[PDB]
Symmetry: C7
Amino acid sequence: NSPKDNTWIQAASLTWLMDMSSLLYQLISTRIPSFASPNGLHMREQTIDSNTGQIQIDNEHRLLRWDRRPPNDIFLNGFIPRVTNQNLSPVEDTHLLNYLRTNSPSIFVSTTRARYNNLGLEITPWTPHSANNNIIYRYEIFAPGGIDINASFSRNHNPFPNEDQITFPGGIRPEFIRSTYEYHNGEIVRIWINPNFINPSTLNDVSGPSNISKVFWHENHSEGNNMDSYNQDFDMFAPNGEIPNNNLLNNNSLNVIQ
Amino acid sequence: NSPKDNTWIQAASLTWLMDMSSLLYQLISTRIPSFASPNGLHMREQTIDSNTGQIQIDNEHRLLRWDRRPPNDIFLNGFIPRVTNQNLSPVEDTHLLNYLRTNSPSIFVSTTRARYNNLGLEITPWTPHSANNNIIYRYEIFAPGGIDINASFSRNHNPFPNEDQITFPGGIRPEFIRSTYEYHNGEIVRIWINPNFINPSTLNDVSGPSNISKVFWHENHSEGNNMDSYNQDFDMFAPNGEIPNNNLLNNNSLNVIQ
Amino acid sequence: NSPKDNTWIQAASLTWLMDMSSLLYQLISTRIPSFASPNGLHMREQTIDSNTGQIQIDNEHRLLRWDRRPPNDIFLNGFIPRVTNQNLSPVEDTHLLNYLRTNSPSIFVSTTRARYNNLGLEITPWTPHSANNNIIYRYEIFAPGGIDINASFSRNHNPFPNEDQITFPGGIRPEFIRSTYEYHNGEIVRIWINPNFINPSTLNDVSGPSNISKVFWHENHSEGNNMDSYNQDFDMFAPNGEIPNNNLLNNNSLNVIQ
Amino acid sequence: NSPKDNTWIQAASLTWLMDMSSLLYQLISTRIPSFASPNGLHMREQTIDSNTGQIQIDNEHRLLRWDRRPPNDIFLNGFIPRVTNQNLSPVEDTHLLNYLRTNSPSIFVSTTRARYNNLGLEITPWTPHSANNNIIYRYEIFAPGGIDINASFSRNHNPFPNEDQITFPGGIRPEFIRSTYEYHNGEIVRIWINPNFINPSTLNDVSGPSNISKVFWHENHSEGNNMDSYNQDFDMFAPNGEIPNNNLLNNNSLNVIQ
Amino acid sequence: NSPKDNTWIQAASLTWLMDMSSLLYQLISTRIPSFASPNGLHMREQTIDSNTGQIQIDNEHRLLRWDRRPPNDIFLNGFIPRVTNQNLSPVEDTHLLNYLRTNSPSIFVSTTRARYNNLGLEITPWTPHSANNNIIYRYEIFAPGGIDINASFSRNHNPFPNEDQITFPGGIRPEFIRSTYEYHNGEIVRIWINPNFINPSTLNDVSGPSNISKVFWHENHSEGNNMDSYNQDFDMFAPNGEIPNNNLLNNNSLNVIQ
Amino acid sequence: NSPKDNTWIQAASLTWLMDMSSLLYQLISTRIPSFASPNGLHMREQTIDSNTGQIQIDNEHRLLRWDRRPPNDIFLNGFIPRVTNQNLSPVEDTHLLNYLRTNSPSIFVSTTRARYNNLGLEITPWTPHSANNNIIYRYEIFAPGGIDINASFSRNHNPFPNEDQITFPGGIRPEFIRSTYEYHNGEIVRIWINPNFINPSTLNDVSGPSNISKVFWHENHSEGNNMDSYNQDFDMFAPNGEIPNNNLLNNNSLNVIQ
Amino acid sequence: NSPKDNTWIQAASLTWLMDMSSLLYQLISTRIPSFASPNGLHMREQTIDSNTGQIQIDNEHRLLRWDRRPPNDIFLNGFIPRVTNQNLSPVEDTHLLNYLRTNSPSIFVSTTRARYNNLGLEITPWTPHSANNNIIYRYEIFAPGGIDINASFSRNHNPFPNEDQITFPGGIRPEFIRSTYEYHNGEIVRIWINPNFINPSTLNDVSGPSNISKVFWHENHSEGNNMDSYNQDFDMFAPNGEIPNNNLLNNNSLNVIQ
């Protein structure tokens, strides 16, 4: 049943949702048959340090988002959902299962979990099929909350499990986005650091290959606008990607064969 | 009478229709005289594998759609109907018989069945009269649901039986479109594969003549925008085409005499 | 009184009218004094061959329409009336007698009967006064229904008899238009065939002089847009034309003296 | 009192007025004091030939209208009034006396009678003061109905008896306009014949000086658009013209001194 | 109290006011304190010849209006007030005293009386302060009605008596404007005659210096559009002019020192 | 309490306010705490000579207004307030204290008193801080009414006393503006006289340095449009200026140090 | 509980808020849980001198605001909030905690306190992360009121104490902005003085490095428009900056390492 607090939606870009936690949980829960979610939605845990009141920043809570939009947009605005207007009706806006299964416009923003091997080394995450084409960004996020999709649905009622998603009703504000990799043709050409990330003391922990241009972003950065040529979530819809392999993410590529 | 589940409209592009299955079935059924449809609408069966929950991909369920719109549009948006707004009134939007007989704007999107001879080899499908003119695409679809038109009406009240149509209220999402043939003057010049097709392990089963350019699509593909110079369904209206012959579809042409 | 079925309006371009047959018949009938139409409106008989359930295609049901609009418009859209919006009020939209007498905008599309001599050979039809000027088209139609004007009103209360009109409330869809003659200065320069005509097996029966360019139309045909330089019905209003003579229509002209 | 039939408004361009004859007559009659029109409005008589039911075409019913608009406008649209919208209120739209006295916008269109001497030869009609300036047209009309102004009002209650006006509530359709003289600087330069005039057998009766260009009009005629450089009735308002003399109209001028 | 007939507003350009005489008189009268107008508004007398019904054309009834707008505007449209819409509310539209005192927008149009010496010779009228600057017109009017301002108010409640104003609720139609003097830099350069003036037999009585270009106007006259480079009444507001002297108006100037 | 007559608002540009004197006084008075205005608003006295009814024109009643708008605007339109629409609500429009303290948009127009020494010679008035920059005008006004701000408020409730402001609800009409000094960089370059000033016999009393261009204004005067490059009251808000000194205003400057 | 007077919002740019003090305080207070603000909002004290009623101008009350907008905007308009329309609903407009935590649009304007060491010498204030990039302004403010954020919330319920914010509901008018430093690449290039600052006698107290261009502003100053290339509060959101160090602010830089 209902969440005790609004932690699950604390990263929200649509800030007005944050004070309507219970109402939102009901609105979403009622379009989910008990057989699909026997125990109800499962919110991620320990997204916040109990000792600090601060975002938990560890491999286990490290989220990723593939997006064609550049840092001058994302580091300024965060991830705003496709639907931004208030509508307390059972319309498609809050229809979670339809959103995941069909990618219909909604108030939800997806992310996928960073993947590690047993030695705790990073391996290929769920990657979009079009990742090797043109310019794409892989944003690194540490945010409070999110719905743990795979833990919320019975295997046979969970539309696409392979994507290992953590969904954010209302989106994610920019202060929860630590960095991003800028890829051109599947190759890393730059690493962007968001100086306004909620925990600036961890900025030096941002990893990447050696000798790759690393830039500290600021509004209207001269090189922060690269983009192709619209559905901002096309590259985050389950059937539009997959986990290509379990190779170590220790090269200059995104580990997808050309 | 009424369908047990919403399988018939599960491919829907107008996703809001999927949760209003019974209401939609009533809305459509009431403008159909009992003498036209003695037993009611007949929904296609076995469109989904009961053992996997997955789309049934076999010759028997292989659908085709002739369209002048290119892959950069279709593989991105799917087949969205001419009418996209909600209207629970008995207007023409849901008037199935008028749509079939006159091609009036509606929420329906049509497909025609792939045709095979007794040896299970492909033969000429229902083809538009204008197929040999300019640029046209023949999309290959495997989707859940659809209304089996020929099985839903007495032949005496079925506007156009030859087309053997399977109609999709709400359209078809792009993940159900596996590939497309690009024809220029009735000749195949390229075969496009949709990497995001719901069952990617079958992509290698896509057939075509030998040595024809085969391309894996991605958004804004450089050659994915070819189009002539609007009624997107003009080339799918029954009187606007026919089954030209039963010849084997084993050449570079669409089997229509120049 | 009332028609048994909606055959009279089955060719309708304004398809929403087809399901409101009785209401439409009342709407029209009430603005017609009993002395003008003692026996009520007389619908054309045998427009559909009951043995085939399809359009009757014979000289006796062959209709013509003079229009300045070219095939790229007409073969695509059919004949849509000057008034296209729904209005169940006794406004001028449905005022049949006013439309005939004055040519006021309405939901009616006019046609005139093809004319034959006693040997069954074609003779000059009712022709517009401006027919020898510039570019004009003479469309050939075989459609279900239509109101037989001369049989609906008494001789002495029938505004203009010479025209032998067949009026179509809601217009005529393109599949009922078999061909058209393109005239330039009163001379035939091309014969256009509509491949999507409802009975394609009769396309070879389309007549015309010998050695005249004969073209099978398709959307946006390169030569299908010729037009002068608007009232689309100007050339179909009774006082705007006449039957010039009873000569055989066996030459390259429209039988009007230059 | 009330007219027996709607003959008085049968020439109407605003066709919707034709079925509201009695209501219109009341609407107009109530703003006319009994002392101004002791016997009520007097409608012209014999505007229709009682042996044929067609418009009476004789000198006695020959009407004229001075207008700056050319044949490409007038022969296509007729004379449409300055006010064209429906308004069953006692507004100025139907205020006949104000219209005649002030030329305020209304649903009325004025014409003036052709003038003849006792030998039945044509003499100078009421002519606009600006007639010798630039380009002006004198249209010839034979229409059913019209209000006989001079016979409708007591001499001292008739604003401008001199114009011998016949007013048409709702205007005059083009089929009632037989021809027009095109004047440039008060000189006839062309005679236009309307081939669509309601009685085409009388077209040869159109008179004019000898050896003047005579043209049979058609839509968009190349020379049918001459016009100066708006109140379309400026040149038909009583104080804006007069009967200049009673000379024979047998020259190339409009009989007004330069 | 109330006027017996509507003579006072018979010159009205806003013709709809003419039938609401009593209502208008009340509307205006109620915003006028009894001490300002002890005897009520005084309408000009003998503006209309009781014997002909014709406009009285004599020095005593000769009115003038200074205006920057040229004959192509004024002789075509007359003097239309700054406020032209119907409003039966006690708004400023009909507020006579505010209009005279402040020049606020209203339905009124001002004129000033022509001035004569004891020998009946014309002397300088009330003239605008800006009269010697650029292009200005002095229109000559003979109209029925008008409110005699100086006779309507008690001297100490009459804002500006020196102007000798005759005010026209609803304005003045062009047929009441006989002529105009066109001044450039305070010098007469042309005399315009309105051929459509209500009494054309008096046109030859129009006076002016000798050998000054005299033109008979017609719509769009080539020289009838001269104007500077908006408040059309700026030059008719009392504080904006004065009676400069009592000199004879027998020269080429407007009798104002340069 | 309430003013006996509307003298206080007689200069009004928003003329509709003049007849709603008592209502306006209430509307303004109710948002003024009794401790701020113990005795209520104090209206200026002797603004109108009781003997003549005329505007009192003496040093004592001489008002000034600093404005960036030129004579072609001001001498034509007067000083119209920032808010011009009717609103009988306690909105900010009539909020006198907030207007004085914050300069929020309202129906009020400020002026400041001309300043004199004990010999009755003019000394520096309250001057805007930006007066020495670019082009600014100092208008001279003699108007009826106005609220005497310093006499209306208890010193510790009066926002800014130093300005010796005279506020005009509804603004000031142009006939109350006698002249203006045009300054460029704090230097007088021209003196403009308004010939339409309510008392033209005093025009020669307009003072200024010797040998400075003196111009009599008229609409669209060629040099009457000089302006910089909007809040028209920026230079009349108390904190935006001050009384710089008490020096004699007998030079070509505005007595502010460069 | 409630504030005794409206001092807290007296600097308001949205002046209509000033008269709705209690209502505003309730509106804001009700969305603040008692555990977050045990004692309610704490308004700054001694922002106004008790003896004179004038603004308290001392180090203690010296506020700063980092803004990308230049003096031609700010010194003219002040700091107007992102939300400017009236809305007495519990919408996000007045949601103080959401504002502070997320930077959502609201009626609030942030400022940060000037920082001093023990000797009372200025040290580095909270500075935006992007301060060394391009052009940024640091405005100096002395205003009445403001909410003392750090004193209003219990440590663990104060989103971002590090900013040491004083928040102004309704913004700050320009007369409370004394000066601004213009930085280019983190270096001071000009010091702007607002001559209209509420206490002009303190203008000489404005400090800065020696020999830096010092300019007295006026509307449209030629160099007062420098700006980069929009969220006007981006550089005032807590996570978007920090207190870089406690070094003396006695150099030309903003004390942030390049």
